[model samples]
Target: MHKCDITLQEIIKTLNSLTEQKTLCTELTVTDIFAASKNTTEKETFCRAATVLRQFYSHHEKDTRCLGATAQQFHRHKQLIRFLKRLDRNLWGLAGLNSCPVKEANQSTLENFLERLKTIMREKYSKCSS
Candidate 1:
């Protein structure tokens, strides 16, 4: 049976699969995620990722009304948000605030954010999991 609770491992695997989809993003690279010299903390990175996901999901709500989103799509959004909160309680407020810069709410942007988050989480897991 599949586990009901979402784990960091599962999130990483999901991101890997999604990123592997060439349709999501073909130009994004690890260099892009780590290129900046800014010393952002892990919490900050997660908060920013949550903000992006929230923004992208909000846009989906608008499109869903017009496009008549399937039940699965609706539930998936709910599930993802639930996972986000599970990752960090502070994300709830951070995601609600207009903290992140204006970004194009599109699949490419979502894919990029997810990839970066995945890379960071993986690195963190590697150092301590042993």
Candidate 2:
């Protein structure tokens, strides 16, 4: 119930999205999203364990998976999506907001999350950008 502008759905959506893009950038680092954004404990706690969805997934070589690993990874990613969705719903219920503006909220949340994460990630995992 933090006064966060980002909704559970929006954040969860991006988290879900992150789970899919296994090869997003470089050394993205999947440690903990909460480690960066310290705005609130609710968000901090939620993100604390999120780990930024597999550490950003930039370096492809680190994927030490076998050939069929692709399928395995894909299916595993689906679980993340499902997990995030449940979190989104759970947060929604916890917050007691009957409805949500998922479209606009997602964009706003996306922007803020990206901005905060970029700064925080660089501070913690400087190798991500450099």
Candidate 3:
């Protein structure tokens, strides 16, 4: 087993909680998430998700505490960046989609994005055992 096994799980755990917290000021649709992914590769998708999530927090000053906590957790997984570099370095840009909104009656959009990311990371984690 690799350290990623633990790292991935920890990342997923954090996401799971964040998804439940639904603390984002942005509104993302399934189309928005799909469109933000410029690359078809899983690695690129994961990188994009991380970048978008970080951006969401960065753009919201009220969520600074949450942003700091999330970044700290992500920093523990240096392997994440290393793995991405091995695949392709062009992995962090979005498709210029607008995800920010002051109020969203339906907050499940970002939750949906996080869940999609979780599924992707879970698949990556599963591949580690084989």
The top-ranked prediction according to TM-score is 3
Model 3 weakest lDDT span, ten residues long: 86-95
Query: How do these models rank on lDDT, best leading?
Result: 1, 3, 2
Model 3 error, position 123 (Å): 3.0
Pairs that clash in candidate 3: none
Candidate 1: residue 111 lDDT (0-100): 50
TM-score of each: 0.47, 0.30, 0.49
Give candidate 1 misplaced runs (Cα > 4 Å): 1-6, 22-39, 61-108
The lDDT, on a scale of 0 to 1, for candidate 2 is 0.37
- Alpha-carbon runs more than 4 Å astray in model 3: 1-4, 23-33, 36-39, 63-108
Best by lDDT: 1
lDDT of 2 by residue, 27-94 (tens): 23334334433454443334433333222222232444421255666465444444444444444433
User: Which digits, one per residue and each the tens of the lDDT, describe model 1 over residues 55-96?
Assistant: 454444444442335675555455543443343333433234
Q: Between prediction 2 and prediction 3, which has the larger lDDT?
A: 3
Worst 10-residue lDDT window for candidate 2 reads 100-109
Better of 2 and 3 by TM-score: 3
Q: Write the per-residue lDDT of candidate 3 for residues 3-100, one digit (tens) a residue.
A: 44555666656555545545323243322345544445544444544445555443444434333457653442332223322222122222233223
Residue 60 alpha-carbon offset, candidate 1, angstroms: 2.2
